[PDB]
Amino acid sequence: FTLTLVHTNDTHAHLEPVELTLSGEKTPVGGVARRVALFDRVWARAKNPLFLDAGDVFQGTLYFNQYRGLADRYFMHRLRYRAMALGNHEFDLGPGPLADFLKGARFKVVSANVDASREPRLKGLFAPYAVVVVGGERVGIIGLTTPDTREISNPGPTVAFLDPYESAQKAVYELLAKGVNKIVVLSHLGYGEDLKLARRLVGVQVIVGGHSHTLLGSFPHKELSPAGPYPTVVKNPEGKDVLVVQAWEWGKVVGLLEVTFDAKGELLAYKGEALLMTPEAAPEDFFAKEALLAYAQPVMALMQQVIAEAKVDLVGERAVVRRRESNLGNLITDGMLWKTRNAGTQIALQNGGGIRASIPKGPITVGKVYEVLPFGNTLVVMDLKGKEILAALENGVSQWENTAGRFLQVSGLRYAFDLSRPAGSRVVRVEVKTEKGYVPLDLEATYRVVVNNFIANGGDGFTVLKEAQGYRVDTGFSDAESFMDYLKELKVVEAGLEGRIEVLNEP
Ligand SMILES: Cc1cn([C@H]2C[C@H](O)[C@@H](CO)O2)c(=O)[nH]c1=O
Ligand SMILES: [Zn+2]
Ligand SMILES: [Zn+2]
Secondary structure (H helix, E strand, O other): OEEEEEEEOOOOOOOOOEEEEEEOOOOEEEEEHHHHHHHHHHHHHHHOEEEEEEEOOOOOOOHHHHOHHHHHHHHHOOOOOOOOEHHHHHHHHOHHHHHHHHOOOOEEEEEEOOOOOOOHHHHOEEEEEEEEOOOOEEEEEEEEEOOOHHOOOOOOOOOEEEOHHHHHHHHHHHHHOOOOOOOOEEEEEOOHHHHHHHOOOOOOOEEEEEEOOOEEOOOOOOOOOEEEEEOOOOOOOOOOEEEEEEEEOOOEEEEEEEEEOOOOOOOEEEEEEEEOOOOOOOOOOOOHHHHHHHHHHHHHHHHHEEEEEEEOEOOOOHHHOOOOOOOHHHHHHHHHHHOOHHHHHEEEEHHHHOOOOOOOOEEEEEEHHHHHHHOOOOEEEEEEHHHHHHHHHHHHOOOOOOOOOOEEEEOOOOEEEEEOOOOOOOEEEEEEEEOOOOEOOOOOOOEEEEHHHHHHHHHHOHHHHOOOOOEEEEEEEEEHHHHHHHHHHOOEEOEEEEEEEEEEOOO
């Protein structure tokens, strides 16, 4: 039996194509219109195609701010997706909007480790796994959601997360008991976690994932540098091959993995490729393009409103903003201090996971600002003891190896951390910027800082900020609006590296 798995992950409301320089020339990459054309051809040509999405459809552009995933859902229906795993961002607005998205979803939404027993709004709207019939054969699809969702999203008090391994292996047994031996895990745990899980589970031949926004495969463009091969192969406890795949992010890539199974559901052969969604891959479907224009109507003005000009590229790539100093991170934090200068703020902290895109040199539109800061978090002014600021910085670099979003970009201070040291004691130096130059952080002194409400409330593992007993006031200042006010003030934006963060003994 031959099955052709066609998949996407972390589309993050990026329905329009983006622009990248490929082989020495600005090229449009991604877009649902182009995906519709490609999928239509795969649907009528490929052998037993099965379309899947690994989660994180939610959060990323004005299309989400305006439709909360419903615009994406319309396209997912047109794209014939058969199953979708719940990602952490599907919980960003709590159970309410998630239920609205699931109510009417004509594809199977799965996650074996999401315990929603305490949430009536999600009853029967998703399942641990699904059984889909393809070419006369049954294929089981087990979903998994990163347990980190508890800290990185807003699932709320009615949703809990279970161990991926225990949940998945149980699902494998249930499927086998039903006579389904061809099983695929649709995971939102991360590439690294998928590789580890693949060495533990038995009965699973393929793991289609996301969460880490990992680019796998090979491309004819020197500008791209994949993190691994497509697919990546590991051995399970029984010495059998397990294929792990991912398709980068924002619909910029579509994965196509053709797997052949025997009667027992064992892997006989496999071939795959990560398809970069450029004009060469396929044209844009006419009607899908028109449909997107329909959705764009209420937010079109914002997408065209230029509020400033970037004289240099403002770097927002996750491998940068979540691991080292970023000039965009410096700009945003500078803006936070600027907006709250009337409050006497001296330091600004911003988690890199909250900076979602780069701003290439050129015009800066309102639409672009919301792609960079999509959450709608507000600025919170609070007094922190030096010890608390230090603890915050430590939490920020505590998961550097996993490129976690808690990493802190800063303004008003500089810090250096040693990666050869254990998590919790990596920050070796912290100095506050003053008129008389840099002064070592005083762990016993109090400093007025500005952060966003998500981390101020304890999100991203910032329990130290949630537990702070000092002065605390939510300004009500929107993050995006505040950043735009700063950009409008500057008019012509320039931002470079200022040695605010020093990475020592980096692997
Ligand atoms: C839900 C939410 C996530 N985030 C960031 C922090 C996490 O590291 C990351 C998880 O995707 O997104 C915010 O900054 N604000 C929010 O409101
Ligand atoms: Zn994501
Ligand atoms: Zn994710």
